[PDB]
Amino acid sequence: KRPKSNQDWWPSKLNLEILDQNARDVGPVEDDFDYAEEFQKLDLEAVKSDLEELMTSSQDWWPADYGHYGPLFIRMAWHSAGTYRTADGRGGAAGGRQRFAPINSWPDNANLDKARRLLLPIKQKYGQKISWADLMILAGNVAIESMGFKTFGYAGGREDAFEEDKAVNWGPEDEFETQERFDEPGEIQEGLGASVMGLIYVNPEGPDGNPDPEASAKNIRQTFDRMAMNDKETAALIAGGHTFGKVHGADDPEENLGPEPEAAPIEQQGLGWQNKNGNSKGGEMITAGIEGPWTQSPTEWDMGYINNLLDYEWEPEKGPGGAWQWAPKSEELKNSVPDAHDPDEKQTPMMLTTDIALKRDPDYREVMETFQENPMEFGMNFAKAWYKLTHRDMGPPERFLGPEVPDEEMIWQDPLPDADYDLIGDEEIAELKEEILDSDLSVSQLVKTAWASASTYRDSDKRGGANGARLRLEPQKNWEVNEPEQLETVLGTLENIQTEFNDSRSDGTQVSLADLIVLGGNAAVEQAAANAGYDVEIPFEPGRVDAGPEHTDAPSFDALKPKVDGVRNYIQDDITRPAEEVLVDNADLLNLTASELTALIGGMRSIGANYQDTDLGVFTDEPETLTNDFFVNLLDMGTEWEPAADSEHRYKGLDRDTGEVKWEATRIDLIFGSNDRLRAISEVYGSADAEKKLVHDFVDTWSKVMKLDRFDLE
Amino acid sequence: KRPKSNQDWWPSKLNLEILDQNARDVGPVEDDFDYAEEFQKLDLEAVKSDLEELMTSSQDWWPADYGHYGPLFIRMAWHSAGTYRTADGRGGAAGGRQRFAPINSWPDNANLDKARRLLLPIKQKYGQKISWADLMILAGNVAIESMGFKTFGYAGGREDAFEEDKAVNWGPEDEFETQERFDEPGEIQEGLGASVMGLIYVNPEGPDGNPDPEASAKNIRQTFDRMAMNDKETAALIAGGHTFGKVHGADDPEENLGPEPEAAPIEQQGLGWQNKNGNSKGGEMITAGIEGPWTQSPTEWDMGYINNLLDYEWEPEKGPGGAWQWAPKSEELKNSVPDAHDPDEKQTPMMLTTDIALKRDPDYREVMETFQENPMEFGMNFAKAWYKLTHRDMGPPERFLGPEVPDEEMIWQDPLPDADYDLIGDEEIAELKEEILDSDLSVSQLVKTAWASASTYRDSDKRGGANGARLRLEPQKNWEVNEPEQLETVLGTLENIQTEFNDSRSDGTQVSLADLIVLGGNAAVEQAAANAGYDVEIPFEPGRVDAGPEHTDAPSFDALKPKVDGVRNYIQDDITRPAEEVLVDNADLLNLTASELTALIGGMRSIGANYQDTDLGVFTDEPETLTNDFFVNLLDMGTEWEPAADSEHRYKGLDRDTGEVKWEATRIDLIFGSNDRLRAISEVYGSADAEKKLVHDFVDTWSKVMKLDRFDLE
Ligand code: HEM
Ligand code: HEM
Known part of the structure; x- marks a missing residue:
C-alpha cells in the first residue's frame, strides 16, 4: 500500500516538492556542516594510495577484468559526470546522485553498482573527510594515472546529496532504452542531454538501434x-x-540479467542486474x-x-x-x-x-x-x-580544494579577478548609497537591474550571480529580458558614480560596479519599504569584483538566458510547457522555498519591477511601495478572472458584480491564487495583520538571492 | 512537462517522502510560531458575531438556499472532520486539509470550495488569530446555533497545515466514486474509513449504487x-x-459540472465544478x-x-x-x-x-x-x-483552548489527572536514576519498557504516549508485543521504587510511575552510552502523571496496537504490506525523519531491545553497549544475505567465503542496506569517525520520542 500521489490523479499539478527540498537539508548531517572544512582535513595522497592498491585487488563477487579495475572506475566517473546538462546545470557529478534512483537504475549504469560498492571500504575509512561525489571522480583519476596517463589535475569540494534531484526532467518516455525525443538525428527535444531515456548521451548501436555511423x-x-x-x-x-x-x-542482457537495483530483492542490498545464471562473473559478464x-x-x-x-x-x-x-x-x-x-x-x-x-x-x-x-x-x-568534464559543475576557483588543484584557472570556471584595492567600509557604503538614491535612477530601475544581475545564479552548477558584473558584458547586456537600451542607461549612471568615487579617493580604496549594482537594489528595496512606513536595513557584503570579457566565455552564458522570469513577469512567446512550471523550475535554481518564492513575487509586484514596465500583476495603487497589495487584491472575490482573447499567457481581472476590467495579469501572477498550496500561502500574506511579515520576508529573500554566489567565505 | 517520479518507475519503492515532511515546516510561518498563543489573543465572540452575520448575507456568485448558508456550512464542517480514521488517527479537521488535494477535489466535497470561499473575508480579517481548521468547525457551530440548537461546546487549537497528509492511504481505487474495497456490505478492506474512493463514508444511493436500505x-x-x-x-x-x-x-452532474478544483482552469482561482448554466443560478445548482x-x-x-x-x-x-x-x-x-x-x-x-x-x-x-x-x-x-466528531483528533484537554470549552472532560479525550503534589528536583532525579540502575532491571528491560510506553503516540490525533502510564492498564498491559508477563515484573519493580521514594519524602513531593518509566529509560540509554565510553546526559522533563482505568476507554486503544515495531523487531505474522512499509508508516506517527529513524533502529540493535530478546538485527558482540556496530556489520560486503528456509521473516547473514552463519535479521534491519536513501544514511553512521555522531543522534531521537505527548508544559 503506497499513498497515491496527487501527481497521479492530476498530471498537470505543479511539482512544489522540489521547492520543499530547499526548505532544509535531508540527511543525518548538521545544517551548518562545512564539507570544505572537512575535506581540507583529508590526507588526499593517502586516499590515492589506497585507491591505487584497490585497482588490482580483485573481489570474487565482481572479478576485475585483466586483473585491473581501472577501466571500470573510469566508466563510473564518466557516467557520474556525464548526466550534466548546460540548459539548467543539473545532472553531473557534484552531488554523486548516481547513487540514487532513478540514475542508479538506468540501463546505461548497469553494474556500476558493483563499481561503487568496491569503493565502500575506502569511503568508510575516511568518513566525512571525502564525499562519495569526490571519491568517485578521484577513483577515475587514479585509474587513469595508474595506467600510464598523467591527469591535468584534481579538486575536491563536491558535497554529497542524500536523494535524487527532483527538479530534473529526464525526458517524456515511459520506458528506459526507448526514445520519443527525436525524429531526425541531431534534432533532439530542447533541453535534454541524451537521445534516449536511461542513457548518458546516445545509443551505442546507432540511432534507433540502426548501425548508421553518420547519423x-x-x-x-x-x-x-x-x-x-x-x-x-x-x-x-x-x-x-x-x-x-x-x-x-556475453549473452543478451534482456533474458540473462536480473532486476535493476531499485527493483531487486532486499537481500541483494542495493546491487542489481544479478545474472539469471550468475552473481559475479568475468569471462561471461x-x-x-x-x-x-x-x-x-x-x-x-x-x-x-x-x-x-x-x-x-x-x-x-x-x-x-x-x-x-x-x-x-x-x-x-x-x-x-x-x-x-x-x-x-x-x-x-x-x-x-x-x-x-x-x-x-x-x-x-x-x-x-x-x-x-x-x-x-x-x-x-x-x-x-577529462578535467573539464569532471569539474564543470563545481563553479569558480574559490570552490576548488586540495593540493592537486592546477595552477591554471580555466575559462569555463568563469574566473573572477582579485581585488587590487581596499574594500569600502560602512562610511563609504552609506556614502555610495546616498549618491545612488540621489541620481535620477528610479527604485524600479535599481531593483530590476540588481535582479537582472543576481537572478542568473544556478545552485545546480554554481554558475551566474552578481559577482563579476557580467550583466554589463556579452551576452547578458543584450538579452531581450534585460531590456538592452534601458539597462545601458542604468549602468551608465552607476559607472559614472563608480568613477567619481574611485577618483575622489586618496588612499587605496575603490568600489566595483558589481557591488554598486547590489547596493543600488538594496537601497531601493529599503526605500520601497520606507514608502510603506517600514524601516528596514538590508545587510550588505562588499567584495564583489568586476569580471572582464577576456575571461568570460560569452557563448557559454547563452545557457543561462531565461525564457521565463517571474519576478519581472517576462514570458517568452514560444515556451512549450506551462509558465508556472518553468517558474518553479527557476525558483529551485535560486534555492527558494514555496513561501520565499511567493513573498518574492508578491513583494516585487508592489514595487513594479516588470519587464517593459507593464502593469501585469501590479495590483496596487502605490507603485514602488513595498506592501501586500498583490495578495489582498488577488484574493478579492469582487474580481472575476478570464483568459484574454488573442493572448497565450494573458488574463484579465474584471469586476464580478458588473463586468468592467480592473486588472491585467499572466499565469505567473494567477498561479498563486489557483494552486492549493500557493493559495494557502497567499492567504497568509493577504491577511489584515500580515503586511509587516510580508515586508520582512521579502527582504530576507532578497538578501539571500543577492548573496548566493559569494563563496569568498563559504 | 513533469519529471516522472521514482514511485512511478518502481511502485513498491518505500515512500520516504512521508518522513521528509517531518524534517521541515513548509509554510511562511516563523519557526517559533505558537498557534495556541495566537488563538488566545482572538476575540472568539467577535468572530462568532461576524459568522452569524454571514449566515444571512447571500453572495451573488453562490446564492444561499432559503436565504440561509447555515446548512451548507454544517456539511462543510462535517466533511472536514469526517475523513478521520481510528486506524491511524489520520484525516479529520485538525489540520483543515480539506483545503488541499486530493480531498479538496473529492466528488463528495463538491461545492464545498464555495463554502470555504464565503469564509475568506472573515479569515483575512482575523489573520493568524484563527486557523482555517478552527474557523471551519466554528462556522458549523454558529450555523447550528443560529438555527435554534445550542452546541455542547467549542475548542480552538487546530493549527493549519500547508500541504496534504502524504502518509494517508485513501484506498486502492484508481478512480473516484468507484470501489474495490468490499465484495459484501459490512466487509470493507480494513484500514479504510470509507466504502468508496472519494466519499466521506458511504454512497448516498446505496451499496454499488443500488437502492438497498438494509445493505x-x-x-x-x-x-x-x-x-x-x-x-x-x-x-x-x-x-x-x-x-x-x-x-x-437539478441536472446530471456528470454532464453539467465542470472539472474539479485541481483540474479546473487557472482563472477559476481554486474553485471548481463550474456550472454550465452559471453558478449564480441557484435554481440550477x-x-x-x-x-x-x-x-x-x-x-x-x-x-x-x-x-x-x-x-x-x-x-x-x-x-x-x-x-x-x-x-x-x-x-x-x-x-x-x-x-x-x-x-x-x-x-x-x-x-x-x-x-x-x-x-x-x-x-x-x-x-x-x-x-x-x-x-x-x-x-x-x-x-x-457533534462535539466528539469535531474534536476527536485534538488530543487531551490540555490542547482545548477558549472560553467555550465545556467544563466536562470526555473519556475519548484520554484525560489525565492533575498532580496534587510538588514535582521532583534535580537531586531527586539523579537519585531515582541511580536507584533504577541499581535494581535488578537490565538496560534492555528498561529501554524496552520506556519504548513500549512512549511508542503508542501518534502525531495525527495526539493519542497515546508515555504520559498517563496507560501501559500498565488494559489493553496495553496485555498486548502480545509488550510481553505481559515480563512487563508485570518490570512495572512491579518500578512501582516499588515509586512507593519507597514517595514514602521517604518529608515535603510535598511525589514521583509518578509515568515519569519513572521514562527516567529509567533515559538512565539505561546513558548507561549503554557510558559502556561504549561516552558521557551523555539525556534531558528529562518531569510532570507526567498516572491515569486510571476509570478515565480510560480500553476498547478505543485497540487502534493503537502495533502490527510492526521496528525498535523491538516485532512483526505480526499476518500483515498485508511488506514490513518496511509499515515501519515507515509508524515512524511518521512519531514525527521521525529518515535519519532519525535510521539512528534509532541502528542504536537500538546495539543495545539489544528486541521482542522476546531475539538476536534479530543485533549485529554486535557487545550487547547493551550503544555503538555503530549495526551499520559497520550491515555494510560489510564480506557478508552475504539470503532468505531463511522455513521462516517467513528471517534472513541469514553468512560469511561469503567461509559459509559461517554470522547473523540473523528481518526486513526491518535489511531495508537500511537496500533502499538507496537509507543506505546513504547508514554509510554515514557506519564510517570510522561516526560512532560518537551516532550516539548523539540516537540520544536526540530517543529524547524526542519520550516527550512527544508533553502538552501540559506549553
Ligand atoms: C558517444 C559516447 C559514448 C558511448 C555511446 C559510450 C559507450 C559505452 C558502452 C556501450 C560501454 C560498455 C558497457 C559495458 O558493456 O561494460 C562502454 C564502456 C567504457 N567506456 Fe564508453 N561511451 C561513450 C563515451 C565515453 C567517454 C566520453 C569516456 C570516458 C573518457 C568513456 C569510457 C569508457 C571506459 C573506460 C569503458 C570501459 C569499461 C570497462 O572496461 O569496464 N566512454 N562505453
Ligand atoms: C451515512 C452518511 C451520510 C451520507 C452518505 C450523507 C449525505 C449527503 C449528500 C448526498 C448530501 C447532499 C450534497 C449536496 O447535494 O448538496 C448531503 C448533505 C447535507 N448533509 Fe449529509 N451525509 C451523511 C451524513 C451527515 C452527517 C453526519 C451530517 C452532519 C451532522 C450531515 C450533513 C448535511 C447537511 C447540513 C447537509 C445539507 C447541505 C446543504 O443544504 O447545502 N450529513 N449529505
Missing part, C-alpha cells in the same frame, strides 16, 4: 554540445576513454549487451584505439549479445587481445557504431587524423577535457 | 465505527445533520446529483427529519439528477416545502437510501423510534456526538 555522429555532436563539449573535446573524450577496458555482452575490447592492451595508455579505428576497415555485425558492434576485416587483429579473465583465451578487438562515427563524420575524422599524427596533442586534449 | 446500513455502521462512532452516535449525527438543508441535483430537502423547514432545528422518515412510507425513484432517491408515497407532503430560491414555488421532501437505511435496519430503527418519542434525548445525543 550517430549527429546525435553525438548534439548531446555532447548540450553537455558543454565541442568537436575536439568530444573526440578526445571518446577516444581517450575507449583506449581503456572493454564492453560486456553482461552489461551493455555488446562484447569485446577496443585495444590490444586495455589497461595501458597508448594509441591503440586511434590506430585500430583509423588503420583498419570495419564492418557491422550482431555480437554474441545480439547487439550491433563492428569487427575488423583484417586477420591480423584476430585474437590479438588477451581475454579479460581466461589466461588461455584470446579475443578480437571491436568498435561501437559510435566509435566508427568519429571516423565517418568529416569533422570528427579531421580531429582524429590530427590526434593520430600528434599523440601529444591527443593526450593533452584528453587530459583537459 | 446500506451495513456499510454505514462499519464506516462510522472506523471513525470512532457507535449506533446511537451514528443515528444522532445523520438525523441531526439532515434536519437542515437539502441535496442539490447541482452538487451530489440528488435534488430536494429532507424537511419542511430546512433552516430550523426540529423533529422534521425523524417525523418525515418514520411517519411516512417511501419508495425508490430516479431524480432530476439521474440518481436514486426516495419520495413520499403519500400526497400530504407534496409541495410542502418552499423552494430554495423561487419565492413563488414549492417542493416535495426526499430521502436518501442512507436515510431509509436508518428506518429499515433493526438496531438503527430502535434508536430512531426512541428519539422520536424523546426529542430531548435526540438533542442531547446529537449535541455530544
Whole structure:
C-alpha cells in the first residue's frame, strides 16, 4: 500500500516538492556542516594510495577484468559526470546522485553498482573527510594515472546529496532504452542531454538501434554540445576513454540479467542486474549487451584505439549479445587481445557504431587524423577535457580544494579577478548609497537591474550571480529580458558614480560596479519599504569584483538566458510547457522555498519591477511601495478572472458584480491564487495583520538571492 | 512537462517522502510560531458575531438556499472532520486539509470550495488569530446555533497545515466514486474509513449504487465505527445533520459540472465544478446529483427529519439528477416545502437510501423510534456526538483552548489527572536514576519498557504516549508485543521504587510511575552510552502523571496496537504490506525523519531491545553497549544475505567465503542496506569517525520520542 500521489490523479499539478527540498537539508548531517572544512582535513595522497592498491585487488563477487579495475572506475566517473546538462546545470557529478534512483537504475549504469560498492571500504575509512561525489571522480583519476596517463589535475569540494534531484526532467518516455525525443538525428527535444531515456548521451548501436555511423555522429555532436563539449573535446573524450577496458555482452542482457537495483530483492542490498545464471562473473559478464575490447592492451595508455579505428576497415555485425558492434576485416587483429579473465583465451578487438562515427563524420575524422599524427596533442586534449568534464559543475576557483588543484584557472570556471584595492567600509557604503538614491535612477530601475544581475545564479552548477558584473558584458547586456537600451542607461549612471568615487579617493580604496549594482537594489528595496512606513536595513557584503570579457566565455552564458522570469513577469512567446512550471523550475535554481518564492513575487509586484514596465500583476495603487497589495487584491472575490482573447499567457481581472476590467495579469501572477498550496500561502500574506511579515520576508529573500554566489567565505 | 517520479518507475519503492515532511515546516510561518498563543489573543465572540452575520448575507456568485448558508456550512464542517480514521488517527479537521488535494477535489466535497470561499473575508480579517481548521468547525457551530440548537461546546487549537497528509492511504481505487474495497456490505478492506474512493463514508444511493436500505446500513455502521462512532452516535449525527438543508441535483452532474478544483482552469482561482448554466443560478445548482430537502423547514432545528422518515412510507425513484432517491408515497407532503430560491414555488421532501437505511435496519430503527418519542434525548445525543466528531483528533484537554470549552472532560479525550503534589528536583532525579540502575532491571528491560510506553503516540490525533502510564492498564498491559508477563515484573519493580521514594519524602513531593518509566529509560540509554565510553546526559522533563482505568476507554486503544515495531523487531505474522512499509508508516506517527529513524533502529540493535530478546538485527558482540556496530556489520560486503528456509521473516547473514552463519535479521534491519536513501544514511553512521555522531543522534531521537505527548508544559 503506497499513498497515491496527487501527481497521479492530476498530471498537470505543479511539482512544489522540489521547492520543499530547499526548505532544509535531508540527511543525518548538521545544517551548518562545512564539507570544505572537512575535506581540507583529508590526507588526499593517502586516499590515492589506497585507491591505487584497490585497482588490482580483485573481489570474487565482481572479478576485475585483466586483473585491473581501472577501466571500470573510469566508466563510473564518466557516467557520474556525464548526466550534466548546460540548459539548467543539473545532472553531473557534484552531488554523486548516481547513487540514487532513478540514475542508479538506468540501463546505461548497469553494474556500476558493483563499481561503487568496491569503493565502500575506502569511503568508510575516511568518513566525512571525502564525499562519495569526490571519491568517485578521484577513483577515475587514479585509474587513469595508474595506467600510464598523467591527469591535468584534481579538486575536491563536491558535497554529497542524500536523494535524487527532483527538479530534473529526464525526458517524456515511459520506458528506459526507448526514445520519443527525436525524429531526425541531431534534432533532439530542447533541453535534454541524451537521445534516449536511461542513457548518458546516445545509443551505442546507432540511432534507433540502426548501425548508421553518420547519423550517430549527429546525435553525438548534439548531446555532447548540450553537455558543454565541442568537436575536439568530444573526440578526445571518446577516444581517450575507449583506449581503456572493454564492453560486456556475453549473452543478451534482456533474458540473462536480473532486476535493476531499485527493483531487486532486499537481500541483494542495493546491487542489481544479478545474472539469471550468475552473481559475479568475468569471462561471461553482461552489461551493455555488446562484447569485446577496443585495444590490444586495455589497461595501458597508448594509441591503440586511434590506430585500430583509423588503420583498419570495419564492418557491422550482431555480437554474441545480439547487439550491433563492428569487427575488423583484417586477420591480423584476430585474437590479438588477451581475454579479460581466461589466461588461455584470446579475443578480437571491436568498435561501437559510435566509435566508427568519429571516423565517418568529416569533422570528427579531421580531429582524429590530427590526434593520430600528434599523440601529444591527443593526450593533452584528453587530459583537459577529462578535467573539464569532471569539474564543470563545481563553479569558480574559490570552490576548488586540495593540493592537486592546477595552477591554471580555466575559462569555463568563469574566473573572477582579485581585488587590487581596499574594500569600502560602512562610511563609504552609506556614502555610495546616498549618491545612488540621489541620481535620477528610479527604485524600479535599481531593483530590476540588481535582479537582472543576481537572478542568473544556478545552485545546480554554481554558475551566474552578481559577482563579476557580467550583466554589463556579452551576452547578458543584450538579452531581450534585460531590456538592452534601458539597462545601458542604468549602468551608465552607476559607472559614472563608480568613477567619481574611485577618483575622489586618496588612499587605496575603490568600489566595483558589481557591488554598486547590489547596493543600488538594496537601497531601493529599503526605500520601497520606507514608502510603506517600514524601516528596514538590508545587510550588505562588499567584495564583489568586476569580471572582464577576456575571461568570460560569452557563448557559454547563452545557457543561462531565461525564457521565463517571474519576478519581472517576462514570458517568452514560444515556451512549450506551462509558465508556472518553468517558474518553479527557476525558483529551485535560486534555492527558494514555496513561501520565499511567493513573498518574492508578491513583494516585487508592489514595487513594479516588470519587464517593459507593464502593469501585469501590479495590483496596487502605490507603485514602488513595498506592501501586500498583490495578495489582498488577488484574493478579492469582487474580481472575476478570464483568459484574454488573442493572448497565450494573458488574463484579465474584471469586476464580478458588473463586468468592467480592473486588472491585467499572466499565469505567473494567477498561479498563486489557483494552486492549493500557493493559495494557502497567499492567504497568509493577504491577511489584515500580515503586511509587516510580508515586508520582512521579502527582504530576507532578497538578501539571500543577492548573496548566493559569494563563496569568498563559504 | 513533469519529471516522472521514482514511485512511478518502481511502485513498491518505500515512500520516504512521508518522513521528509517531518524534517521541515513548509509554510511562511516563523519557526517559533505558537498557534495556541495566537488563538488566545482572538476575540472568539467577535468572530462568532461576524459568522452569524454571514449566515444571512447571500453572495451573488453562490446564492444561499432559503436565504440561509447555515446548512451548507454544517456539511462543510462535517466533511472536514469526517475523513478521520481510528486506524491511524489520520484525516479529520485538525489540520483543515480539506483545503488541499486530493480531498479538496473529492466528488463528495463538491461545492464545498464555495463554502470555504464565503469564509475568506472573515479569515483575512482575523489573520493568524484563527486557523482555517478552527474557523471551519466554528462556522458549523454558529450555523447550528443560529438555527435554534445550542452546541455542547467549542475548542480552538487546530493549527493549519500547508500541504496534504502524504502518509494517508485513501484506498486502492484508481478512480473516484468507484470501489474495490468490499465484495459484501459490512466487509470493507480494513484500514479504510470509507466504502468508496472519494466519499466521506458511504454512497448516498446505496451499496454499488443500488437502492438497498438494509445493505446500506451495513456499510454505514462499519464506516462510522472506523471513525470512532457507535449506533446511537451514528443515528444522532445523520438525523441531526439532515434536519437542515437539502441535496442539490437539478441536472446530471456528470454532464453539467465542470472539472474539479485541481483540474479546473487557472482563472477559476481554486474553485471548481463550474456550472454550465452559471453558478449564480441557484435554481440550477447541482452538487451530489440528488435534488430536494429532507424537511419542511430546512433552516430550523426540529423533529422534521425523524417525523418525515418514520411517519411516512417511501419508495425508490430516479431524480432530476439521474440518481436514486426516495419520495413520499403519500400526497400530504407534496409541495410542502418552499423552494430554495423561487419565492413563488414549492417542493416535495426526499430521502436518501442512507436515510431509509436508518428506518429499515433493526438496531438503527430502535434508536430512531426512541428519539422520536424523546426529542430531548435526540438533542442531547446529537449535541455530544457533534462535539466528539469535531474534536476527536485534538488530543487531551490540555490542547482545548477558549472560553467555550465545556467544563466536562470526555473519556475519548484520554484525560489525565492533575498532580496534587510538588514535582521532583534535580537531586531527586539523579537519585531515582541511580536507584533504577541499581535494581535488578537490565538496560534492555528498561529501554524496552520506556519504548513500549512512549511508542503508542501518534502525531495525527495526539493519542497515546508515555504520559498517563496507560501501559500498565488494559489493553496495553496485555498486548502480545509488550510481553505481559515480563512487563508485570518490570512495572512491579518500578512501582516499588515509586512507593519507597514517595514514602521517604518529608515535603510535598511525589514521583509518578509515568515519569519513572521514562527516567529509567533515559538512565539505561546513558548507561549503554557510558559502556561504549561516552558521557551523555539525556534531558528529562518531569510532570507526567498516572491515569486510571476509570478515565480510560480500553476498547478505543485497540487502534493503537502495533502490527510492526521496528525498535523491538516485532512483526505480526499476518500483515498485508511488506514490513518496511509499515515501519515507515509508524515512524511518521512519531514525527521521525529518515535519519532519525535510521539512528534509532541502528542504536537500538546495539543495545539489544528486541521482542522476546531475539538476536534479530543485533549485529554486535557487545550487547547493551550503544555503538555503530549495526551499520559497520550491515555494510560489510564480506557478508552475504539470503532468505531463511522455513521462516517467513528471517534472513541469514553468512560469511561469503567461509559459509559461517554470522547473523540473523528481518526486513526491518535489511531495508537500511537496500533502499538507496537509507543506505546513504547508514554509510554515514557506519564510517570510522561516526560512532560518537551516532550516539548523539540516537540520544536526540530517543529524547524526542519520550516527550512527544508533553502538552501540559506549553
Ligand atoms: C558517444 C559516447 C559514448 C558511448 C555511446 C559510450 C559507450 C559505452 C558502452 C556501450 C560501454 C560498455 C558497457 C559495458 O558493456 O561494460 C562502454 C564502456 C567504457 N567506456 Fe564508453 N561511451 C561513450 C563515451 C565515453 C567517454 C566520453 C569516456 C570516458 C573518457 C568513456 C569510457 C569508457 C571506459 C573506460 C569503458 C570501459 C569499461 C570497462 O572496461 O569496464 N566512454 N562505453
Ligand atoms: C451515512 C452518511 C451520510 C451520507 C452518505 C450523507 C449525505 C449527503 C449528500 C448526498 C448530501 C447532499 C450534497 C449536496 O447535494 O448538496 C448531503 C448533505 C447535507 N448533509 Fe449529509 N451525509 C451523511 C451524513 C451527515 C452527517 C453526519 C451530517 C452532519 C451532522 C450531515 C450533513 C448535511 C447537511 C447540513 C447537509 C445539507 C447541505 C446543504 O443544504 O447545502 N450529513 N449529505
